[PDB]
Every structure is written in C-alpha cells, then in structure tokens.
Amino acid sequence: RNRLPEPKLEKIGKKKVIITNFGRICQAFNRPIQDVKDYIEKELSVGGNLDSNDALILKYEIQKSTAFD
Amino acid sequence: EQFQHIVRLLNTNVEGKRKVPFALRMVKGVGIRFAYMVCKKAGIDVERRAGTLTAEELERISEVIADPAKFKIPDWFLNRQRDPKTGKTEHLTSAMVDTRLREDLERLRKNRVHRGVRHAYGLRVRGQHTCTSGRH
Amino acid sequence: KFTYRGLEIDPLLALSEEEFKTLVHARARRHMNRHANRRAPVLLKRLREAKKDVKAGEKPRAVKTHLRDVVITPEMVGSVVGIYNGRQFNAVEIKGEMIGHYLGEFSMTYKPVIHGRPGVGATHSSRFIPLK
RNA sequence: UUGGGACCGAGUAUUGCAAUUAUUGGUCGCGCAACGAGGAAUGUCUCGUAGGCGCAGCUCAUCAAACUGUGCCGAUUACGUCC
RNA sequence: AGCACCGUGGCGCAGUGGAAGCGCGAUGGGCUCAUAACCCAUAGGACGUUGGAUCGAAACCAACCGGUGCUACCA
C-alpha cells in the first residue's frame, strides 16, 4: 500500500508526451536514471530521450490520462 | 645609426613609433596633452622615436609631465583638479591611475552612497539603461 | 580622520557661508545661490535642537523628514536623519565624508533585484518550462 | 595603429520652484572594452529613383539615434514571366 | 572455469599507420496563421587502463580490467 508519486504528463504537439515528474519517481524506488528509462521506452517501442531538465520525452501518443501507470 | 626598439619612459615599455606624441599615449597620456612639446624642451615633430638622450633628451619630457606648474600654469588640462582629500593636485600618471581610482571607489563603498552601491554590483553608475544592453 | 579638501572638522565649521560655497563642488554652489529665502526652514531647527540637548557618549535623537533635496553642510554633521524612500524612514548618521552630497543618495528607493528563474515566454523556443 | 570608441573618475557653467538614480553642454585622463565585412534566413525598391549627406518644423524650462517636411551629391540592372 | 567477440562525444556507432567524425540528442536561433516536417549555429572526447613494437597511430603485440555471447556445472 506504499505511496508512489503519481506520474503527471503533458501533451505537446499532439504527438509527444513529456513526463515532468520522471526524476522524482526514479529516486523513490531507489533505482538509477538510464536503466529505468530503457525499460519504459522498450515496451512502448518508441524513441525520445531524457536529458533536459530531467523531464522525459517520448514519441508515443495517447489521449491524456492517468493510464501511464 | 642605432634605432629604438622597446624604450622606456616610466620603466614601462614603449614602441618606437616614428611620430613622438603617439608613442607617449602608452604612458596615459593622450594626444591633446602632448602638444605642449613647445614647453617640453624638445619642440620636435616629424621626428622618430629613437632620438632620445642625445640632444633631444628624454628627462626633459619626463620632468614636464611630473610637475606642470613651472613650464606653464593652466588647469582645465589636468586629470584631477581640486582633489576631495587634498586642496588641489595636477596628477599625470601611471603609476597611480590604478591606485587613485581605486581609492575613490573604496571611499564611496564605506559610507554607502548610491554611486558606490551600484558599482559594487558591477551595474552601470551613470545615467544608463539595462535590460537590452550591455549583455555580457 | 577625514579630509574634505585637506580640512579637518574645526576649519570647516569656522567657515562663513561665502568661504563655504567657494570650497564646494559646482552643484552645491549652484544650489545655494539659486535658493536663498530659507528653503530648509524646519530641517535645520529639528536637528540643532536634539543635537544640543545630548549629554554625549551617544548619538542625538533621530529626526524624520521626507525631504532629500537639501545639501549636507558641516553644521549638520553628527546628527541622525531620516530620509523617506516612499514607505520607510531610513537610518543614516552623518559622517564628515558626507559633506558635498545630498541626503537622498544614502537612502535606497528600490530593492536591488536578484531574480528567481525565468518562466515561459523567455526563450522563444517552446518547452512549456516545468515548474517555474 | 593615430581605425573605433563602450565603460569609467575629477573640475565647471547654464536650464528649473526642485537635476541625487550622474539632465543638458563644454576640456583633461580612462581606450591594452568590443568589433577585421559577417551562418540558416529575411526586408523594399525601376529615375532625379536607390544609396550617401546635412538643415528645419514637430514635442517644448531643459534634453531626439524618433516622426513630419525641404534641399544637396547621385548610380547599377531589368523594362519580363508565372516557376 | 576456459573460449570467442567487443570497449571511441549524453546514447548507438564509423574509422586496415600521416591519426577526432556520423546518426540520434541536449541548448539557442530560422523557416510555418500554429504543430509535425525541415535547415543552421553552439558546447560536449584521458579513442578502457598499463607496458611493448613502430620515424610516426586510436588501429598492430602482450598484461590487467570491464561488458556480452558460447561451452563448463567442480569431492
């Protein structure tokens, strides 16, 4: 019943989805950055990167939801 | 025979430029000072720097920069007139351009007058505008 | 220590109005001449009042004024003056090196700016900057 | 570099009831602060025009790199097409 | 436990001796009524580490280290 930060999204350009809360989330369950990112991006089979101000980018497009979970 | 190459006039090296005033600019020193060459006891223009300590001797020039109140006495021509810690001064340096300046700075810094506040932050201290230029 | 023009405190005090405005910069001179007819009627009095009354070993009682368009003469040196930036009377004591100035110069009228991260609209290119 | 000046200190006079966060002139020092023909891209022009250059009016105690108007010096190319 | 291959910019990699590059990126501009699409300018390299061969290499040889695959299964 632990508490995990609720990932929160943005729809930019109606293609990309930026995930602001990425950095905070990865910290919480105590795993690093690149490795976590890999798994996500592999499943969805898209590109995009991280870098930046540690907000993720993905080329996957969805109707905005909490269904990233 | 022998030409100049890296002369001195302050124990500071000075190019052998082939017109005389333009060499002295290095000493700070600028054109509308120098033209006192009349009173400096080498009246020369159109004459090389290389001819120094011959019979157009060097310390002639040098002395007239040190004390210009016996080779003629006008102000409106001097770096610092009516000092605000002594009564009056002439002042033609280096070396004291980076000392006298710095002391004025320090004075304002202390008692915290507006000019001195603005200059500690490195912001413009005159009229001036910011937010479009200068940008570093 | 302090030298205004190579003058300690006692010489400065000794000078009459004529001998004074001769000695000072161009602004100060220009000011005094143009004025005449008082033009600091209260701001002299209030100081010299509380100045006198002191038993020394401490500064005079502070006086407050809005005005800042008035010079600093060697008369008013040692006093504690208020100067008003539009919401706060500000504390200044008057040193011997504040002679040849005005009051307002010592009293700041803005907070200096120090920034706090630029928001959206700064950077033309768009990212919709999280979170500030 | 004697090309360019940006910044910066001191002195002085005028404008105004009030010039401090320098208002405007006017001379000394600071020039060793930039900048050596400028990427992707982009602006409007066909003859007294383009471009270069200066003056006045405007605002108005004071201050014009702006705007409005007038004059001087004065070209290159095209006078075609629908991409 | 051996064998094989690999180690180069944030990430994936090119480069058989005259020896710092490319694709994705990050950051800032430009194209567009906006977004994709698409151009341009910036910063970002102990070429795994050590020794050796060589006039001279990141490239060849050896030693060690790390990563991955294959075979090993340890009284």
SS3 (DSSP) at C9: helix
The answer to whether the beta carbons of residues C99 and C12 sit under 8 Å apart is: yes
CA distances (Å), C78 to each of C20, C51, C89, in order? 18, 8, 18
Phi, psi of C94 (to 5 degrees): -110, 115
**Strand D–CB B77 distance below 7 A:** yes
Interatomic distance B133 CA / E31 C1' (Å): 27
**Is C13 domain-assigned?**
yes
CB contact under 8 Å between C130 and A55, yes or no, is yes
Q: Is residue B125 part of a domain?
A: no
Number of domains making up chain B: 2
**End-to-end CA, chain B:** 50
Label the pairing between strands A16-19 and A9-12. Answer: antiparallel
Cβ neighbors of B81 (< 8 A, separation 6 or more) are: B75, B88, B89
**E35 closest protein residue (CA to C1'):** A13
Nearest-5° Cα angle at A60, A57 to A64: 90
Range of the domain at B108: 75-120
Same domain as B112, residue B67 = no
Query: How many Å apart are CA C15 and CA A64, to the nearest integer?
Result: 82
- Amino acid at residue number A62: I
- Owning domain of residue C83: 1-114
User: Can you tell me the distance from the alpha carbon of A18 to that of A9, in angstroms, rounded to the nearest whole number?
Assistant: 6
| Nearest nt to the A59 alpha carbon by C1' | E36
Pair B93, B113 in one domain? yes
Tally of structural domains, chain C: 1
Q: Does chain B reach chain A with at least 3 CB pairs under 8 Å?
A: no
B15 shares a domain with B60? yes
Reply yes or no: is the peptide bond before residue B134 cis, omega within 30 of 0. yes
Number of neighbouring beta carbons within 10 Å of residue B9: 19
What span, in angstroms and rounded, lies between the C-alpha atoms of A40 and A7? 13
N-terminal to C-terminal alpha carbon distance within chain A: 15
Elucidation method: cryo-EM
Q: Is the CB of A57 under 7 A from strand E?
A: yes
Residue B18 resides in a domain: yes
> 101-130 in C: which are within 8 Å (CB) of B?
101, 105-106, 108, 112
Is the domain of B5 the same as that of B66? yes
> What's the Cα-to-Cα distance from C89 to each of C83, C106, C109, rounded to whole Å?
5, 12, 11
- Same domain, residue pair B6 and B68: yes
Q: Is there a domain that residue C127 lies in?
A: no
- Between CA C89 and CA C62 the distance in angstroms is 10
Say whether both B26 and B83 belong to one domain: no
Which among B90, B89, B31 is positioned nearest to B64, based on CA atoms? B90
B51 and B96 together in one domain: no
Asked if C95 contacts C106 with a C-beta cutoff of 8 angstroms, the reply is no
Please check whether strand D approaches the CB of C99 to within 7 Å: no
Strand partners, C81: C63, C92
Which residues in range 4-63 of chain C are in contact with strand D, contact meaning CB within 7 A of any of its atoms? 24-27, 29-31, 34-35
d(CA C4, CA C12): 9
